[PDB]
Amino acid sequence: EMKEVLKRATPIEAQVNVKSRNLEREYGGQWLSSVTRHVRIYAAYIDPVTCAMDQTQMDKLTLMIDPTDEFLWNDETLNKVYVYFEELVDHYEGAPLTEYTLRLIGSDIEHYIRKMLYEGEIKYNMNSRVLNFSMGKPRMK
Amino acid sequence: IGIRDFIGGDLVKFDLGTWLSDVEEHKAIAMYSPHEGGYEGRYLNRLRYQGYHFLDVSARGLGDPETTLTKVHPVCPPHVGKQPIARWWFPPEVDYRLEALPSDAKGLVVWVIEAKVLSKAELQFLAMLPSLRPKVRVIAECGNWRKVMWKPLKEIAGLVPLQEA
Amino acid sequence: PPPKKPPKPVYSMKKGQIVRVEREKYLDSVNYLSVGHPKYYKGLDYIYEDRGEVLDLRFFETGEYALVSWVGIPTSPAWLPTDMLIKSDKLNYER
Amino acid sequence: MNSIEFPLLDQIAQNSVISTTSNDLSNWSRLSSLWPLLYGTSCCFIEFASLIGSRFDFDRYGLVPRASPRQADLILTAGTVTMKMAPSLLRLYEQMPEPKYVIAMGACTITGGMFSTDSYSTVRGVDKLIPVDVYLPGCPPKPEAVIDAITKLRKKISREIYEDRIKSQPKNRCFTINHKFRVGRSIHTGNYDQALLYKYKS
Amino acid sequence: MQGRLSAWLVKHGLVHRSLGFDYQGIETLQIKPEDWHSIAVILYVYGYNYLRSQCAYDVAPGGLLASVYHLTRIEYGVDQPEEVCIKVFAPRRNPRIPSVFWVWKSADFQERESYDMFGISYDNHPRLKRILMPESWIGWPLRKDYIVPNFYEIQDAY
Amino acid sequence: MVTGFINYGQQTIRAARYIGQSFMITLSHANRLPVTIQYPYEKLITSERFRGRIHFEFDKCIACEVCVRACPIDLPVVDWKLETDIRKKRLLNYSIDFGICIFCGNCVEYCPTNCLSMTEEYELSTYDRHELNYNQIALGRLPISITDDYTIRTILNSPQTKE
Amino acid sequence: SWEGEGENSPMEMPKGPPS
Amino acid sequence: TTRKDLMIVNMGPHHPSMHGVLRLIVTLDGEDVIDCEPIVGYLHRGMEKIAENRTIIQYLPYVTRWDYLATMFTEAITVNGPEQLGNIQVPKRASYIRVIMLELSRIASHLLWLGPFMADIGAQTPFFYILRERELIYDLFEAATGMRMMHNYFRIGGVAADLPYGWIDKCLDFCDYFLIGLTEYQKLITRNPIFLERVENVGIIGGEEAINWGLSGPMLRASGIQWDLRKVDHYECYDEFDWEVQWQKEGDSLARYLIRIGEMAESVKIIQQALEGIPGGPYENLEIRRKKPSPAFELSKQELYVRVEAPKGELGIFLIGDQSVFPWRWKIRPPGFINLQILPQLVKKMKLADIMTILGSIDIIMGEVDR
């Protein structure tokens, strides 16, 4: 019973009038990000309302799960993925901001997403643009 | 032959009412289209306008459509030598999509692409599928032609004598 | 002539044995320098998940080694020392 | 059980002349001018080049290759996508304007192909990175098979309605936290072979 | 049998060790890492114009890392050129081998590959960084005891 | 001083001549017939040893699994069980996934019973990846020859040279 | 095992102009 | 002028002039290249690691994926490493077939170099013009081997199968047509004023620098060096045919273009001479040809280095066996990977539009640069 998933991942305080900025000359040329069909981890501040990404804010990690919707997401499932992301970020304390660390974090996050899909937490999103089942076809147990 | 052949094969024709009447009367329809494709969407689009939801089935890898579509079927995922052989069981595709459709949908339309590779009996079953499942319409591309023409699939499969058009 | 007297110098395990790697012994081993990860990285968890399978065994000048490849992982197998591996009982893996 | 589910939606629209024929003509226009990205990575691109050439013509379907993503409708992924290239591939796909279509050509683009077993850097299929409309099997697929895959893509394109547009825009959900990682500048700064003769340091 | 280059080196008093010949009879010599930077210049002085290939390989897992150099001569009027293989062995714990980029420029990329795949650090190489693998990668993939850290996009296409 | 202008004249007429030569060489191709094969209205007849989709004979398979070992990726899946009455290997399932297949030809070459063959069936594109997992029924289907399709013009690459 | 050969060879430049 | 004036542009993996996925970090001072940094490895599939844990009959399909234009050269080096290790002889007919296929692949590789080179210069029609005849080469290969590319035709101790009936006359007719096509190419391109003024004085390389940098093939031969590994190592049957090593004295890109055209002509002469004097007898070695479990080729326990004259230079294999089916070490010496490292030296103090000409002068394909 009880509330469950009571961690309730707290995001950083939302900024206003954030404008899109490219990476500087010394920090540019690198990915400082891990992008993949279901997960985008950016060392940047991305706001969803105006679609503005400030990449000079390297002290923030913005996580976007399922941009091209292949799964149907409730708020509880989003909170579960977000608390797992927070725990993974706190677990990797002291690691560099290189692409390798963020790719590892995205890999564990997608393994968690596949585990949630196979456990029944989330289902494939019909009425999607494509129906290819990148995590596996519907199968019986 | 010419004259009529070289005259407009335009896609503004009023064949669409006849097409919908045929797809409602004859549940299973064999369709013939231009080789370069893209002139089928005018006819499938109105079916999707009536609430029908499409299930795209490739007939090349269909694999005995009776147990592939109307039964739970065993499939082995491809190991590359790193895993032991696993036998997975998949739900019946058309019935899974039927029971998972929203209640407001008119039904399911099975778009069988490249149905020329199927044998005679497979086409017989594909034509007789809507009899077993009432809310299923069958559309199968059985070839290519200069202009879009459709026939009952039972006539092509051999259940009905092929009346001259 | 044989290397010692039998055709093979006799090994600790048999080919196809399901093995599981020590965490601590692998971490202080020389071979971990090939990966170079810090201690808190979570890329090598499946190593300890009792998935490995021995394909071959050989006596190199640095000791006895087994070429292990983990079931379900489509990557190249690795040569690991026999002291840091345990022969296990079951596969303990489902796809 | 990895099940599937249909979300809740409203009734479509229904129209007599204007909207339906406008949608059909838009679909037909996007049929005949599927400009490829000219995205080439590996050996399969050679066969892609064989589809630009004279024996099999790209121009009959339209399909003029455009270098910039902003001018490209279709990305025809030819070649293995390594770990070093996959973020670049996803950017290039994202920078393409909607509506956009993806064809995974080659066995290395569908599931990794020969590198599905022992390669430590090959992405096993771009369906893990980009939504693929048509899968094209074959190591160097014959250019006629590429044209057949493009024909099937046209078959699916002509079936589109206006509702599919709201299936295409991203939902754009975000979540921002501090990371307390170590920030480091780029290793590849562009300094190369400049004042090299003074870099001996005996 | 003593090779031509080995006889020349023992005539000039240069320390080395002859490991034999390959299947084609090309001499194979072993050079200590501390003397390799001095011996490479003398090798060019002998007349080895062409650094045909630079390679690195694993002698044994958990063992020594060997760096291989193939050398030959490009000259007018020579019928059969003289080719030599030379191997320098470094420990796995901290492999350090001097760079021959200041003798033959052809090593410029190749030694970087030897750094990218096996982790052999070359001292006087001015631009020693990963060339084939991503620049932020941790680990040397071609070592016999390397283990891939379970990336999602490397796993099976489900 | 005049010789400089003269040399400028002769090194300008040469460029005009060579530009006209490029124009003539390119425009002489307008009098030549096109080489384009108009797919899909015209199809090129494949060679006698073209490596396409696999055809599998279920009755001739003995589940010896040498086709798996000869494969570069161990792709073919041979699910079999032992028939204890006769102690012979009974085949249950045979599956080749063509999303991973490279059509190298090792299986059809090293099969001892010769039940695996290469057909001319290219153009196996599908909308769904998992539809490329052909089982023993899909592999057993006879390929559709382009010579049997009479709505297209089958193109032969070279003269038959069988005289 | 063995030993590193040509450890100055104990003669090397025996008489004549040294190399 | 050190910073905030120097534009660092990433002419990277997605660029029409970048053959494949080569990346150049180019620093420009008003269309003048101060320097450039080559980033490669966007196609690194780890093929040296896949070379182990694979038998030769399993690794042979993987071989054609480096240098996918000249596939027969990679297949030849892969099948002649272990057959030299095991002392396997090759029959004369198989050797002649190998020579013919290698020369045809050299012709095709030089063609599909000329195409992208002139495209990068600015002419798009020569791409279609080379493809008109590379399709004929593909037709010959598919008639003989069974596929256009990735032939899987070369085998240890011979070839996969004998030439089909009616192949010699078809190849001779192809040679007769291709000589005319090459004359048309030289008429259209070679003296063009725009082509010359784009090519005549770019990328001057000294012979000493070419030797020191490890260059091979048309790169090294275009600096006054007559170094061909077909005549130095006496490969196959190249000592029996009359042919000339194409080399030029000047170092510019025009010398490389002329060298590749002359190499195509000499290759055509080699096919003509080989088909005129084709021998009989077997093609597969009957000694090695022998439901039962089938082992692969067990490599002997010794090191070996084998070289071949690829159209891009010298392609090498360093093979260390382990008395087992899987080789212990399989190092690939790629000609393009070593020819590419001279590019920052050449493009330094040059212009932005000259980078395309320099990179098209070098026969670089990214599938062979990384492995």
Ligand code: SF4
């Ligand atoms: S199918 Fe894959 S391995 Fe084969 S050429 Fe294409 S990209 Fe390379």
Ligand code: SF4
């Ligand atoms: S080699 Fe032939 S007979 Fe043996 S298992 Fe494979 S398909 Fe069956």
Ligand code: SF4
């Ligand atoms: S054709 Fe080659 S890759 Fe395909 S299943 Fe047969 S052996 Fe495997």
